Design a protein around this nucleic acid. Structure first.
Ligand SMILES: [Mg+2]
Ligand SMILES: [Mg+2]
Ligand SMILES: [Mg+2]
Ligand SMILES: [Mg+2]
Ligand SMILES: [Mg+2]
Ligand SMILES: [Mg+2]
Ligand SMILES: [Mg+2]
Ligand SMILES: [Mg+2]
Ligand SMILES: [Mg+2]
Ligand SMILES: [Mg+2]
Ligand SMILES: [Mg+2]
Ligand SMILES: [Mg+2]
Lengths: 115, 86, 25, 55, 67
RNA sequence: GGGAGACUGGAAUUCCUGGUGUAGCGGUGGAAUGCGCAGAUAUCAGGAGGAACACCGGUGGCGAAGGCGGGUCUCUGGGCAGUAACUGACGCUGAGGAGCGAAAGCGUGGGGAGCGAACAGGAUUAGAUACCCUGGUAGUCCACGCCGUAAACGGUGGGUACUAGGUGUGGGUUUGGGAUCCGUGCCGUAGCUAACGCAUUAAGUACCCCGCCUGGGGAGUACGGCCGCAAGG
């Protein structure tokens, strides 16, 4: 058991990983959109994370985590779908907050893709 | 450029009469000590290019006063160079 | 203004600077 | 003044946001003199570790 | 040459002011909290260059600044 | 944020060591090459190292231009305003000449995270020596030299005087308001222009000095000469 814990939703442009955790940072279980079924583009969807974060919300229930702090990393679709399906499956939401890592002009990025 | 007490020492020494300041015999004395300070500065730093532009404008300004003093009277021109050294 | 002038002047430079890679010996 | 240094945090908590970034001259309506002296004093106080860089 | 040194750890000196206790906004070389000692010097520039070399090394004070 | 030198800070990226974990990660228009099942990505710790300095921050500042933002102290160059004391036209331009001059590149020696020409593999396609993708050396950085070019642009040489006003914003000085000298923007009358537009910061009305032009191509090429280690100018 972890009686109180913490969730880390990284949502890239091409994927979402939902990983529920204790407060010390030692993960209990996890789910990605590719783990549910999908390949290629359908990992990146709004729906993708809705079905995955229910698979992340359970396995937390196997150990028995009934309240979980929320952490949004990444820009991407399904900010709401990860948040809402964690509520809809079980475990009501403790706190939500942005943790997208802004650099103070760190490294230089890759060159501009022109499609 | 220089400190306020330092400037009066070379000013009162080289000045034609008292309170003269801008007379070209008095005025070159200010520039010469200022160049002597900056030639020590550029020995240390070396790649201070923007401050070196200022140094050339001091020397360019000084040589025009040497041109002016030479034309007016030749005795004061040589007495200027004798004391300072140029 | 218009860039017919400089595109005309460009192809003189390209076909010159190809020679000075070739000749280069 | 209203003297402005990096000592007084009670001044600098006004001109900082809650997410810990310096407020615009469009928001407050300071002079350009004072936005310099604030933003230097914030960057000083940021080294002193009175203020965080973001919450 | 009027200059101020605040110093944090848990040749005429004009004042001394230990404030004594605030929390740090971020954590500095592990630890938390500490002293706040504003030294308020009136000393010349050359010496105060090598004051910090003495004062930094001891480790008694965690961080230094100058004005 | 004009310059140079030293000390120094936190975010973020990559990699190494341990903590937790299971089988996906990543990438795209859609995919594959690739990395992972010898425990990757994800997540929490600490650690070494490099490069850049989010908001403040822009029709804003400073510099001759090129250009210049983390913070503090040294050592520094220029500019503006003000009363007036002083020198007494010492000014202005400037052929040749000399000095600064982004990026790229070059020589010797360090450094190396992320980016990344050339190169390899995947995809696309009739072909793909490309666009898109994973990896990636020179390079980018630091110190001493080197060339001396850019849509090095306001595509407008430098100096000086005069010729409505309307408004914004930066630095002053003066008597919450009016004056006044420097800057920097946007509309606009007379005037000018082929037209677009400029318009008190002129492309207006004038005077001094330099640079350069005389149909489009051949050509900023040949040849000679100078500079350069070379590319080349
Ligand atoms: Mg007076
Ligand atoms: Mg010439
Ligand atoms: Mg370079
Ligand atoms: Mg090199
Ligand atoms: Mg590539
Ligand atoms: Mg040219
Ligand atoms: Mg330019
Ligand atoms: Mg023309
Ligand atoms: Mg003119
Ligand atoms: Mg107009
Ligand atoms: Mg030639
Ligand atoms: Mg020749």
């Amino acid at each position: 058991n972890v009686p109180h814990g913490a969730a880390h939703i990284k949502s890239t442009f091409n994927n979402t990983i939902v990983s529920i955790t204790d407060p010390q940072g030692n993960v209990i279980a996890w789910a990605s959109s590719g783990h549910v079924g999908f390949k290629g583009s359908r990992k990146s969807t709004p729906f993708a994370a809705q079905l995955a974060a229910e698979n992340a919300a359970r396995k937390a229930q196997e150990h028995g985590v009934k309240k979980v702090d929320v952490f949004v990393k990444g820009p991407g679709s399904g900010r709401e779908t990860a948040i809402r399906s964690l509520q809809a499956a079980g475990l009501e939401v403790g706190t939500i907050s942005d943790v997208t890592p802004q650099p103070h002009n760190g490294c230089r990025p890759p060159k501009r893709r022109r499609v | 450029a220089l400190t306020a007490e330092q400037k009066k020492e070379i000013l009162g020494q080289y000045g034609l009469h008292d309170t003269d300041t801008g007379s070209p015999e008095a005025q070159v004395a200010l520039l010469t000590k200022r160049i002597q300070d900056l030639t020590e500065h550029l020995k240390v730093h070396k790649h201070d290019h923007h401050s070196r532009r200022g140094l050339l404008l001091l020397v360019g300004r000084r040589r025009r006063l040497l041109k002016y003093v030479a034309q007016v009277d030749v005795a004061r021109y040589r007495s200027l160079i004798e004391r300072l050294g140029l | 203004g218009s860039v017919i002038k400089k595109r005309r002047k460009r192809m003189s430079k390209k076909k010159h600077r190809k020679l000075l890679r070739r000749t280069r010996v | 003044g209203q003297t402005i240094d990096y000592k007084d945090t009670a001044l600098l908590r006004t001109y900082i946001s809650e997410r810990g970034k310096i407020r615009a001259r469009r928001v407050t309506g300071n002079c350009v003199q004072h936005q310099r002296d604030i933003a230097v004093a914030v960057k000083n106080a940021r080294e002193v570790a009175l203020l965080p860089f973001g919450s | 040459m009027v200059i101020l040194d605040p110093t944090l750890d848990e040749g005429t000196v004009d004042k001394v002011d230990i404030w004594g206790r605030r929390r740090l906004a971020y954590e500095i070389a592990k630890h938390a909290e500490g002293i706040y000692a504003v030294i308020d010097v009136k000393a010349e520039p050359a010496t105060v260059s090598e004051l910090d070399r003495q004062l930094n090394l001891n480790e008694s004070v965690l961080r230094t600044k100058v004005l």
